[PDB]
Symmetry: C2
Subunit: 385 residues, 2 copies
């Protein structure tokens, strides 16, 4: 097997790249190519040929169950061996990552770009028929919810043929022809266009100029705020009023929960007053306060309200689990700060990972004294007050 | 207690700030001020007054043994309460952090700037007498080895009076008068000036324009390479020849260790061929490959030599401990990748945290498939090849 590389595009999906490789190298379709590629890897005894996928919908390493590192080893070998000139193959693939988006969503990565798993499309993947016909390849952005309009042609992406059959370019090809009726697939909220342009990485006021992974983070965050599908209109609205618009969400959240508080003030946990908002904002995907503007604003608000109302904020209860996520440290690290005299529990008996033994004020001052990094530190939000 | 804030300087040491506060608010010296400050905190019953320091050499939170978070709570309260206008106090303090510089050095942080603990001066702290007399305050940079020349006056910092008594501005004051002989303290390698200027944060060719924490990281790294005090001349030399100068260090390291190899090739561990260099370079202080240019070059070299010599590099042995530092993951995470079928050990019995069960090639492909972040990823070094 020896292949001509197609014209490289840095925004091409991995599936589109393989489709073009198949088309331009005389294979009948991508499936025949993937089967021939698996046979090639078997003929050179590359460990991992057994799990090489022949289903174009399962090609990315995130789709591998147990063989994700055999998959990346395979792409590396193919890149380094089977082309006249080596293509960028690994850089187009969507891999799993270790990162999380708060509170508990997993994530994936392509190149240097991290995405919440909640945004990774599970079923049919849409397309822009204008992009396919004019460019001859598919964008990786079509794999991710939130990107609902083509930022270059300013029209909504298309999911289904007018005949009713869903059009997935991965299965039906880059020519944009419906598999069932054999007709060419054929086609304006500016807010949708604004956030699509922003997601693509371009300046789009009033949305903030953050690294790409944190833009996807804000989409995930907004979804959680509303507990529903991403609403482009209220998102743009929100940022057109930033940061006051967020100061109102915080204040309104505290005042509602404090009033609906049925337990004693001394028994109030941080989760009871600011649960959703605080623990939903810590990793978007990380705690870099130049980039995680939600956490920066929240922490600036909390430092400056710390000791008001005889320590309302400072006294809010937390457990060891919550402190570890706050501080980005291990439970074992927490135990060592409590057995020594650095972290002091409220109830002085003589560590339940889950009992609410600590006070926000103590954990906050512990962060300052022991857990600031070059990215996650007070100096990056003091200008927000 | 009510105080006038001194003229703020963003580069002032915490000790110098307190000295000026004492001088300008009628206290006899800084010690009397710190004692009065401790009495003030006791009069308002601030928890932490008992550990408030009265030794100017022990004022930073890093000098607290068990009370570092009482110390930051104290600074916060003092800032928010005892001045006509609130000063930036916390931002001048040197705190401990959780970060490490490879292989096992601890770190501290001031503002957003992280430093290796190995550079934090333990004994007498030097000064520039020109800075003291012209500016009336001391720079925080004087606390850190590597910064041996004043970058603004282009002269070496001074440690001891001509009479022999060491001059520590913290104890002897900002007036630059020797405590023993009562004489004013009185005073040219351009490489020293170059790296001093670079450490201060300014452009200084041929040294690389990285965030400050990674500049201190390179000083720590160079010290380890030579196993001795920082040598400004060979450091500048090294970077005047970058990156070829590092390609030579790698190649020379591999060829020496491979030749001095007494064990069988199949038994070669990664540590045996590239021990010092690889595990000395992972966290400087982190794995961001835009900033940790040592790790980026090393990983680019390793990916592209992976499968040469019938997998010399790929076959190098590693244990679970080494993989966790490589991958930035937990030992428990490693166990879950081996009990599942993602990470495959070499010897197939049926996890010793220390046995060399894994191959570099497997761990490297696992990093790609499962552990790339927005900062620690292949796309940030492919341009180095
Ligand atoms: Zn389009
Ligand atoms: Zn149709
Ligand atoms: Zn000077
Ligand atoms: Zn003297």
């Amino acid at each position: 097997m020896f292949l001509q590389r197609p014209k490289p595009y840095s925004d091409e999906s991995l599936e589109s790249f393989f489709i073009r490789v198949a088309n331009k190298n005389g294979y009948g379709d991508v499936h025949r190519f993937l089967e021939a590629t698996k046979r090639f890897l078997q003929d050179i005894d590359h460990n991992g040929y057994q799990t090489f996928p022949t289903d174009i919908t399962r090609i990315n390493p995130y789709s591998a169950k147990n063989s994700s590192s055999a998959r990346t080893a395979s792409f590396l070998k193919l890149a380094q061996l089977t082309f006249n000139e080596p293509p960028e193959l690994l850089g187009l693939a969507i891999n799993r990552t270790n990162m999380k988006y708060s509170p508990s969503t997993s994530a994936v990565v392509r190149g240097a770009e991290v995405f919440p798993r909640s945004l990774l499309r599970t079923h049919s993947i849409p397309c822009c028929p204008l992009c396919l016909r004019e460019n001859g390849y598919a964008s990786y952005l079509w794999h991710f919810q939130g990107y609902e309009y083509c930022h270059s042609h300013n029209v909504p992406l298309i999911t289904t043929c007018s005949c009713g059959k869903e059009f997935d370019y991965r299965v039906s090809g880059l020519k944009g022809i419906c598999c069932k009726c054999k007709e060419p697939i054929t086609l304006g909220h500016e807010a949708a266009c604004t956030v699509s342009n922003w997601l693509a990485g371009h300046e789009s006021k009033p949305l903030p100029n953050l690294p790409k992974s944190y833009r996807w983070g804000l989409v995930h965050w907004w979804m959680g705020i509303k507990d529903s599908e991403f609403d482009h209109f209220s998102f743009v609205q929100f940022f057109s009023n930033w940061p006051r618009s967020f100061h109102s969400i915080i204040e309104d959240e505290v005042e509602f929960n404090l009033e609906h508080a049925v337990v004693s003030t001394s028994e109030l946990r941080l989760k009871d007053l600011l649960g959703r908002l605080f623990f939903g904002s810590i990793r978007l995907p990380e705690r870099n306060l130049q980039h995680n503007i939600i956490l920066g604003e929240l922490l600036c608000y909390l430092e400056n309200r710390l000791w008001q109302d005889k320590g309302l904020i400072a006294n809010l209860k937390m457990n060891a689990l919550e402190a570890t996520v706050m501080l980005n440290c291990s439970l074992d690290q927490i135990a060592s700060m409590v057995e020594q005299r650095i972290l002091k529990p409220n109830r002085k008996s003589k560590l339940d990972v889950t009992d609410y033994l600590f006070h926000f004020g103590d954990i906050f001052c512990l962060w300052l004294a022991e857990f600031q990094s070059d990215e996650f530190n007070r100096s990056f939000y003091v200008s927000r007050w």
